[PDB]
Write a protein that binds this DNA or RNA. Sequence first.
DNA 1: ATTGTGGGTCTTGAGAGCAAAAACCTG
DNA 2: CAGGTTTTTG
RNA 3: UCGUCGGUUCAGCGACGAUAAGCCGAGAAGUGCCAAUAAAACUGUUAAGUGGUUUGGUAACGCUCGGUAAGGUAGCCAAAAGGCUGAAACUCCGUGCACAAAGACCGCACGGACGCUUCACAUGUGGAGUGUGAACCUCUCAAGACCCACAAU
Lengths: 416, 197
Amino acid sequence: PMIKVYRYEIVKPLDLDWKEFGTILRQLQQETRFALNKATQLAWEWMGFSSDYKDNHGEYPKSKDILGYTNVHGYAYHTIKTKAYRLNSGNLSQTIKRATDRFKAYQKEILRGDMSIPSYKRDIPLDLIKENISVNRMNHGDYIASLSLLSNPAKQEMNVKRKISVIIIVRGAGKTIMDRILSGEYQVSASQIIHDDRKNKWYLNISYDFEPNKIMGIALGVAVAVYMAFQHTPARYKLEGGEIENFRRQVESRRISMLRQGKYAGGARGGHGRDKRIKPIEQLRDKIANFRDTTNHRYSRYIVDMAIKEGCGTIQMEDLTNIRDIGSRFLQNWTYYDLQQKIIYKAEEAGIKVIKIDPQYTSQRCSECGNIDSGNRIGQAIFKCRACGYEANADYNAARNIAIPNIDKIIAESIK
Amino acid sequence: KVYRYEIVKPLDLDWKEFGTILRQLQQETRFALNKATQLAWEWMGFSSDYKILGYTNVHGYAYHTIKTKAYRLNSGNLSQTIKRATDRFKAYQKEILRGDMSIPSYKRDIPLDLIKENISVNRMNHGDYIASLSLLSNPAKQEMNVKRKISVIIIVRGAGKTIMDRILSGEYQVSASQIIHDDRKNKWYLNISYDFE
DNA sequence: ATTGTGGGTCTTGAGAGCAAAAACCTG
DNA sequence: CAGGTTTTTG
RNA sequence: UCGUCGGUUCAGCGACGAUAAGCCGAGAAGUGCCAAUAAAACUGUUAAGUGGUUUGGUAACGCUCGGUAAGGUAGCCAAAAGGCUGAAACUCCGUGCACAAAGACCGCACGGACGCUUCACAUGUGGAGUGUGAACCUCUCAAGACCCACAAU
Ligand SMILES: [Zn+2]
C-alpha cells in the first residue's frame, strides 16, 4: 500500500471567525514546535545519562526503572503535556513520536559526530492523526472537514463546543481523491495543516494510503534534456528543453538584476536586517523551485506513460552519484534527485520496477557492436562507431546502452 | 581576521604519527565539547527530575570534570574548548528553554583549539616557514615520547605571505588559532587569527 | 578573483505517513 | 448502559 | 516588465495593482555604551607579575514577529426583529438544491447543446473522457555544496 498526499484549501471555519481560527492555528504551531524540540532535548538527555550510567555500572539503564516509561516517548509526552495542553493529545503524541523516532533512527550518527542534533523550525505543519480528521459532503455540494485540533482544556478555554469544522475546496483531481476517500477506497493516514505564505492559504494536506523482460533506458542527453530508448523495439522518445532554456535565461537575468540592485541603498528594505533584502530573491527562488518541480512531474509522467505504452516492465536509468562529477548536460544544475524520485514512485504506482545502473562509458560504448572507445564520440551531437560504422544521435546510443540488461557489468567486463 | 595555511609535513616527526596525534586530539576536543554542553545543561537547572556546588561558574566545573578524561590535550586548549561550548550554551539557553532550537552539537571533524600561548611562527633561512604548536600536556609527552612544541612546515604565499611577514615583524599579533582538517582536499590546515590596529 | 572567518540559502538522501487500552463525555 | 472522544502509554 | 484573484504547481485568458526590487509598526539574542574584571593557563622557591575576558543593566544602526494595492456582486417588506427575492469568477441553455457584503457569496447536482482530444470501424459513424492547456505524494530533518558581511591580496 502506497501513501500519497493531496492538499485541499481551507476557505473558512464553521462557527468561528478567521481571527480566532488563525490565532488557534498559530498557537498550535507554537506548541507543535515546542513539543518537537523538547522531545529531542529529552532524547538527548537520556542518551547522555545512559552513557554515564554505562560508564558507572557497565550496563544500559532501563528507562522503565528510571524514567517510569518503557520508552523515551512516554516520558517525553508526560513532560510535554503540561506545557502543550492546547494541542490535542493524539496530535501531541504523534508529534513527539516524530521527534523521538527521528532522534533514535540517527543516534549513532549524532554520537560519532556525523550528524547534528535535529532542530525544528517555526512554520511547522500542524499534525493530525487519522482519527482527528473526518470529511463529509453536504447536500448542496460543500465539503466539511471536522478536525480535533484542541484538547478539552483548550476547548473550554476558547469555548469551542465540538470538533472545529472548516470548508475545504474539493475540486479537480482533489475531488476524485476525496470522493474515493469518502467511498472508503482510500484510507486517510496522519495528515497535516500547513500554511502557504505566498497565497496566505491554509491547506489540509491529507495523506492517503491505497493499494496500487522489456526494459526502458533513459539518458540525460547533452542536446536533448531527456531521451528514452527501448529494447526489442526501435521506438524512440525524447524531451527537449526549450521551455527550460527560455525560463533559465529569464531567471538568470532576474537574479543578476536583483543581486545588483540589492547592493544599492534602500530605506525600508535595508531597515530590517533579515527577511528584508531577502524577500524579492526568495520569491524568484521559490518560483524556480516550483517550475522545476512541475517540469519534473511532467517528465516523469511522460516517461512512465511511454513505459506502459510499450509494455516495458522495467526502467533503467543512470545512477547520478557518479554523474555529479561531470555535470555537463542539457539541464544545467537540475534537480536530478527530484526527477529520479518522481520517476521511481510513479513507476511503482504503474507497477514497473526501477533499476539504477552505473553511467560507466554508456555514451562511449556502441549499443550495436558493443565496442567501447574513448574517442568513439565524434562531434557534440552525433555518434559514429568505426567497428561497424554506426551513425546515430549520441543520446539515442546512450539510452540504448542503458536499456541493455546488466549493461554496467558488461561494460566493466569489456574494460578489463 | 583569520588566514588558513596548509601544512605539507611535520618537521619533528613523520606524517603518520603526527596524524595519529592530531586525530587523538580531535577526539578529545569533541568529547570535551559534548561533555561541556552536558554540564552546562545540568548547571542551568534544565536537567530532568531523574537527573554541582563548589564552583563559581559552569566553565570551571566543566573543566575540572573533563580534565581527567582529556589528559592528552594541553590544559589551555582544553579550557578554550570548554569555554567555546559553554559560550554556545549561554548564547542559546533561552531558545533551549523555550523549546526553539533543541541542543547545540559539534561536528566530528572539529577544529583543534590553540590558545595564543601555544602558537609561534618563525622563518628558516632555507625559506620554510615553521610553526611551533603546543598540542599536548605532560602526561601526553611521557606517553607519546614527543617534545612540547611540535614544529610543522607551512606553505606561505601571496596574501598569506604578507600576513605571516606582518606577524613576524610584530605588526600583526597572533591570537587563538585552530587546526582543522579538510576531507575533500584531505589536508591539515592551521587557521591563524591575527589582530592589529 | 582567491584563500580563509563570521551569519544565511540550493541539490542529495532518509524517514515517515502509530496503535491499543482506558477514562470522560455524552445519548 | 452506549458510543464516540480524549488521554496516556507501548 | 512584475504581481493579485479566478481550487493546488507551470503556462494561457478575463478583470485589476504596482514607487511593492515600495513604504511603514512594535519587541528583542547579536553590535554599540556603562559599570565589571569571573574561569583557566603560565613565568616565578613562594610572593608577585602577565596574557586571558566574565557578570548585570542599557539602547536599536544592524535583528524577531508583523502590517500594508490588486476580480465582481440583485433590493424591497416589516416599528424592529425577522421575512421574501435571488446578483456576481475560465462556453451556453433548462430544472432543482443553496445563498443579503463578503478572508467566509459568486457554488453544486442532473439533463441537453456546442467545442476539444483519444480510441475503434467504413472524410464519415460509433464509443470514451473533459470544459483554457499540462501535471498534481508531500512534509520534516540533516549532509555536501552555494548566498551575504569581514581581513590579506
Ligand atoms: Zn558499432
